[PDB]
Paper text:
Antifreeze proteins (AFPs) inhibit ice growth by adsorbing onto specific ice planes. To probe the molecular mechanisms responsible for AFP activity, we here characterized the antifreeze activity and crystal structure of TisAFP7 from the snow mold fungus Typhula ishikariensis. TisAFP7 exhibited intermediate activity, with the ability to bind the basal plane, compared with a hyperactive isoform TisAFP8 and a moderately active isoform TisAFP6. The structure is dominated by a right-handed β-helical domain, a typical DUF3494 structure.
The crystal structure of TisAFP7 was determined at 1.54 Å resolution by a molecular replacement method. The crystal belongs to the orthorhombic space group P212121, with unit cell parameters of a = 57.12 Å, b = 62.99 Å, and c = 101.21 Å, with two molecules in an asymmetrical unit. The final structure was refined with R factor of 0.195 and Free R factor of 0.229, and was composed of 446 (223 × 2) residues and 746 solvent molecules. The refined TisAFP7 structure exhibited the root-mean–squared deviation (RMSD) of 0.37 Å and 0.34 Å from Cα atoms of TisAFP6 and TisAFP8, respectively, reflecting high sequence identities shared by the isoforms. Analysis of the TisAFP7 crystal structure revealed a bound-water network arranged in a zigzag pattern on the surface of the protein’s ice-binding site (IBS). Among the approximately 54 waters molecules on IBS, six water molecules were aligned in a small trough formed by the inward-facing hydrophobic residues (Val22, Val213, Val195, Val177, Leu150, and Val126) at the β-sheet region of IBS. The interval between water molecules 3 and 6 was 14.51 Å, which closely matched that between the water molecules in a prism ice plane (4.6 Å and 14.7 Å). To survey the bound water structure in the IBS loop region in detail, we next compared the structure of TisAFP7 with those of TisAFP6 and TisAFP8. In all these isoforms, 12 water molecules in corresponding positions formed a zigzag-pattern network with branches, shown by red spheres in Fig. 6a. The average distance between the comprising water molecules and the nearest carbon atom of the interior aromatic side chain was 3.4 Å, which implies that these water molecules were constrained to engage in hydrophobic interactions with the Phe43 side chain.
Author numbering: 1 to 223
Write the structure that this text describes.
């Protein structure tokens, strides 16, 4: 049940892929790669980077995986151009899907809900002021098309019920994404603009932002 998948292509190789900046207030805990392009590695800030021997990737104690930037040694720039391309394809694929199963459902107030598999369209901002559940089997899909901003309120959490997988949940957000302090998010975020994860928040999924990503001692676990 649910809509056809949004293939991420090589964007699915990153916990965080951004185009303009990635910032962190230590100590973030990222499991997976962090890539930035076409901005240079100087737009990865707060990571206390160490450039590795080849000059093609760097490391941070805040990242289990490699960081890469557009200015790093061949072949890292080419890798990242293809990843950024694949992110753009993915975002457009998800944003342009027709025939939603849910239209303006709950006026975009997801607190206390249990969301069944489907394509969801809101011509609005979406938010949750209370915990909510995404409920379906390990093979069910969700696409959340959001024309406005996406938020998740401080300390609030998204629960997976029924065997639902984060990698099967796609948030396609045109507006800014703000995950408030201590909140726990589930899903892949295909963001047209900025994404922010505030102090002690967590996300199981990926952050694929066409502008900036801002972390504040945040946990990002690739799914």
């Amino acid at each position: 049940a649910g809509p056809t998948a949004v293939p991420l292509g090589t964007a699915g190789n990153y916990a965080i892929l951004a185009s303009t900046a990635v910032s962190t207030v230590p100590q973030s805990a990222i499991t997976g790669a962090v890539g930035i392009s076409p901005a240079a590695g100087t737009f990865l800030t707060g990571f206390s980077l160490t450039m590795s021997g080849t000059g093609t990737f760097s490391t941070s104690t805040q990242v289990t995986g490699q960081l890469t930037a557009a200015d790093y040694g061949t072949p890292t720039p080419s890798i990242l151009t293809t990843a950024i391309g694949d992110m753009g394809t993915a975002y457009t694929n998800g944003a342009t899907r027709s025939g939603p199963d849910f239209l303006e459902i709950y006026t975009g107030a997801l607190g206390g809900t249990t969301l069944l598999p489907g394509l969801y369209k809101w011509t609005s901002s979406v938010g949750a002021s209370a915990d909510f559940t995404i409920s379906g089997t390990s093979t069910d899909t969700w696409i959340f098309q959001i024309d406005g901003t996406l938020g998740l309120a401080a300390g609030k959490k998204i629960t997976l019920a029924g065997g639902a997988q984060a990698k099967n949940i796609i948030w396609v957000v045109a507006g800014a994404v703000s995950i408030e302090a201590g909140a726990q998010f589930e899903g892949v975020i295909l963001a047209k603009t900025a994404v922010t994860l505030k102090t002690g928040s967590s996300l199981n999924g990926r952050i694929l932002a066409q502008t900036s990503v801002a972390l504040q001692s945040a946990t990002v676990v690739q799914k």
